[PDB]
Design a protein around this ligand. Structure first.
Ligand code: KJU
Ligand code: KJU
Lengths: 547, 547
């Protein structure tokens, strides 16, 4: 029985193959057939290319040797090469043109998801070209999805030498009959077959995947649309900044480029952005996913006033100051979305662009107390239940697993009616003791939230709701302002609390506002519809937030 | 007696003043004198500018109101404005032209260094212009050097209103007679004087500083060249990455832009880069200053082999993978400099550029054992003493304060002869029990190193020297390669171990190598000559490593 899958890089996990460019250059330049492919393999195991593939020399050192071989080949075939011909130019274009073969990667992901050990086995070089970063980025994206990456130039062994295959089996800790090996070069496939490994000669992806499905007994082709890459908490870079004596902010950091600061809602975590973090970083941004004050590994002081918008915003500005960031794009959801609109209103010089999921921007009413305003809308009754210190803490902290299982549910699975919460006497009064697991979350993801909330509980998080008057007085100072920096409002069709309709007057205050809308999406936007969230954010970031 | 100094921003800490541009535009456009300055102050306390300065409206909202006032002013003076005239263009250029007044900042730094509480008090606006980042960067650089920053648009009060002065005194927790106030606008200086504050009308900086010196009794003018900004450990962003089960790497992070990974030597810390971190970040780079494996808050496993170059380099590649960085520029010193040359040789695709302080690149000799090579040079005797497990640990761990005080010394202060260390029986055998404090370090900086080394001691750090054979075998695999990515070699005239002369053949292997050289500089390069290190690195980074 198979339990390991090995993939080549060129012509298998990445397309078009670099080998095919030598043939394509011959055809485009009307050179004798196989002239370039011949100079490429010149000397065989003792030639320049084998030395390159074993790591003896670098790609930049190999370029002049390939050039000499091209001259030697043209001399024998009694032909000439053009006076503008460049091996460097040919390879720069070929490497840049080569992209990940998405259905092949999806097949490897599916096999690993079922318990397979996956590995990339590749004949590659030490790239010291001025444009080497492109290949580095490609290898970085691919490698994270595999258990092992074995590169010829690093191991000093090359395909088809039999030692690289014995090395492969040793790293896999598996016998050959347990291994599937996919390669586009038949000669490189031969030693694996000789050892008794299942082999697949890859020409077109579709046929290779049909062969792969048949031999593994796992559906890999025509399979449903997969979820974006998630985060494993133990594999992230964790950052810690002291914003003041008793307050430290924790964040997870991934990627390079313009800083994008992700701000979660209630009662969440940096982990609520698990599907956005790898996508945004891959898109060319430096992601900073916060544990907001009161949550996870960030400090949770008990005082109500430590959680008013004015102090929370001041602390986020201090956070940028301590990291040495003059700006960041601010993206928020729920309470994080409210924070992000206030960052834009009070600190525009520090906000590259602002985006909110679900939370609209509604200017404070100076002629009405914030308490009356909340009372006017039946769906905001849960906010009134949250006012009395200790009451919601007790119910929310009683059973953490039940708390997150009851709250985190999709539109068609709801267990909590947020109207008449005070009258009923709690959020979970007509809720089961052992709620069913939502389709949006695994049991493991629920337990992460459970473990995070074991540290500080719900006091700090509930305090975000306990500053209605303080926030209202501060917000009233901004009533003459308009938001004129780049802004995105993302509405969720089925969020019955933060309804899309509540955002309808936003262009009165944000005239240049851009919009996104997600159908069949509840309140937990990021995990309800991750693919569409990622699509909307990446499109808006690339157009309005730079790169 | 004075104990507080307050500085205005425009015309005081930053020059040329924005006010002077209104007058300059009038002269350049041959408009009636004071026409623009008149439209600017139109309406006085009820006018558009006061609303802007109090935070009622943003700068982008103010621009059309200033334009209308310019029209109203030209109508009264019976003149016309050009058909290309733009308030936005005038202010964009003025703000961009305004830079920190370096001698004024140096005076504030000196006063704060002597125990003064310092503050910036400024009439400013909420900047939402597309080019607002420039001003944000300027405010970021300035604010870090002061105890308080009070901005009119944030406090809703403006100079010369008397409430902003009472607010200033309340934040300072000081009586007026204890306060010096520097302003370039006499009217704004008046209420401070009325309260009994010492005031200085700033026209030219030099005269203002002579007045400041006279009144404080502290030398501020003609003073020696100050050291670059250092780091306060508790004010940094601290990052943590697990590179494998028992190994976590700690780093300090500051700034935005291309990633610059700083790699210290033996027996050091991320803190050895304290003078480079703020300079490199201010220069437009994202700095990652490592605690190398075996040091500070990074893991320190006991096994010798955990510290061979091959594993250390693999872990640094994993560190970039986990942070989502396809590349970083690698800058190393001593053991860090050796690590950085091997990163360039084995992982060029991940190395944007490479720089070494003191450590030259010398290819391994395949015809001689590394032990014989070390024996051939008398200055490398300390390396032989470091070979036996437990011996150097005992001497180095016996008294930490004595250890760092004896090692960290400038060229003219040395207490340790590194020849005949084994024969003598240790590094500190002819060394005092209570060494004098070097001019390079404060007692506080020594105690930071003492506290860091209390965690793991010297076993992990000493193990970097215990892999001579392993490193030699690995290095021999790279003997056919050349370093062809951008490289900088920085030599220190007076380092008697890593002598400048040992780097003389480096262009045989790094043909495009760039160089830096520091005279009257010992082994502890970064702290011996921080100003010159910063100058050399920033110049090479800007020319060869991007931005
Ligand atoms: O379904 C929803 C929508 O709005 C909400 C708002 C707040 C909280 Cl705590 C939960 C939900 N759940
Ligand atoms: O003065 C010096 C120069 O070289 C050195 C090399 C290693 C160590 Cl641990 C100390 C020093 N000190």
């Amino acid at each position: 029985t198979l339990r390991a899958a090995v993939f080549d890089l060129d012509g298998v996990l990445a397309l078009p193959a670099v080998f095919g460019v030598l043939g394509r250059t011959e055809e485009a330049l009307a050179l004798p057939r196989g002239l370039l492919n011949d100079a490429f393999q010149k000397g065989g195991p003792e030639g320049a290319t084998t030395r390159l593939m074993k790591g003896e020399i670098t790609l930049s050192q190999w370029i002049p040797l390939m050039e000499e071989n091209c001259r030697k080949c043209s001399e024998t075939a009694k032909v000439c090469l053009p006076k503008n011909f460049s091996i460097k130019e040919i390879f720069d274009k070929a490497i840049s043109a080569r992209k990940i073969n998405r259905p092949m990667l999806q097949a490897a992901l599916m096999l690993r998801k079922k318990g397979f050990t996956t590995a990339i086995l590749t004949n590659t070089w030490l790239d010291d070209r001025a444009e080497r970063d492109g290949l580095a980025q490609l290898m970085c994206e691919l490698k994270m999805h595999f258990d092992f990456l074995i590169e010829s130039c690093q191991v000093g062994m090359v395909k088809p030498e039999p030692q690289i295959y014995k090395f492969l089996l040793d790293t896999l800790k598996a016998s050959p009959s347990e291994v599937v090996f996919l390669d586009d070069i038949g000669a490189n496939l031969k030693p694996a077959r000789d050892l008794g490994m299942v082999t697949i000669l890859v020409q077109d992806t579709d046929t290779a995947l049909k062969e792969l499905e048949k031999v593994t007994g796992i559906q890999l082709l025509n399979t449903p649309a997969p979820l974006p890459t998630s985060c494993n908490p133990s594999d992230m870079s964790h950052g810690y900044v002291t914003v003041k004596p008793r307050v430290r902010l924790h964040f997870v950091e991934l990627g390079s480029g313009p800083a994008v600061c992700l701000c979660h809602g209630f009662p969440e975590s940096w982990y609520s952005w698990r599907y956005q973090i790898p996508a945004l970083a891959q898109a060319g941004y430096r992601v900073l996913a916060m544990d907001m004050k009161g949550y996870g590994e960030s400090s949770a002081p008990p005082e109500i006033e430590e959680y008013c918008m004015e102090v929370l915003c001041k602390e986020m500005v201090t956070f940028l100051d301590k990291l040495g960031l003059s700006q960041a794009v601010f993206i928020g959801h729920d309470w994080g979305g409210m924070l992000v609109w206030y960052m834009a209103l009070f600190y525009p010089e520090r906000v590259r662009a602002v985006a909110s999921l679900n939370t609209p921007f509604i200017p404070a009413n100076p002629n009405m107390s914030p308490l009356e305003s909340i009372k006017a809308n039946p769906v905001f009754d849960y906010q009134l239940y949250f006012q009395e210190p200790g009451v919601a803490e007790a119910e929310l902290e009683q059973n953490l697993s039940r708390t997150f299982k009851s709250l985190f549910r999709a539109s068609d699975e709801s267990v909590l009616s947020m109207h008449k919460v005070c009258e009923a006497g709690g959020l979970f009064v007509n809720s089961p003791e052992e709620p069913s697991l939502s389709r949006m979350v695994t049991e493991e993801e629920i337990q992460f939230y459970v473990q995070q909330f074991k540290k500080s509980g719900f006091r700090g998080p509930l305090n975000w709701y306990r500053n209605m008057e303080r926030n209202w007085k501060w917000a009233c100072k901004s009533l003459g302002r308009k938001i004129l920096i780049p802004a995105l409002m993302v509405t969720a069709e089925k969020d019955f609390v933060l309804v899309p309709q509540m955002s309808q007057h936003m262009e009165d205050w944000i005239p240049h506002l851009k919009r996104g809308h997600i159908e069949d999406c509840g309140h937990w936007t990021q995990m309800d519809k991750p693919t569409e969230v990622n699509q909307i954010l990446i499109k808006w970031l690339d157009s309005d937030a730079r790169n």
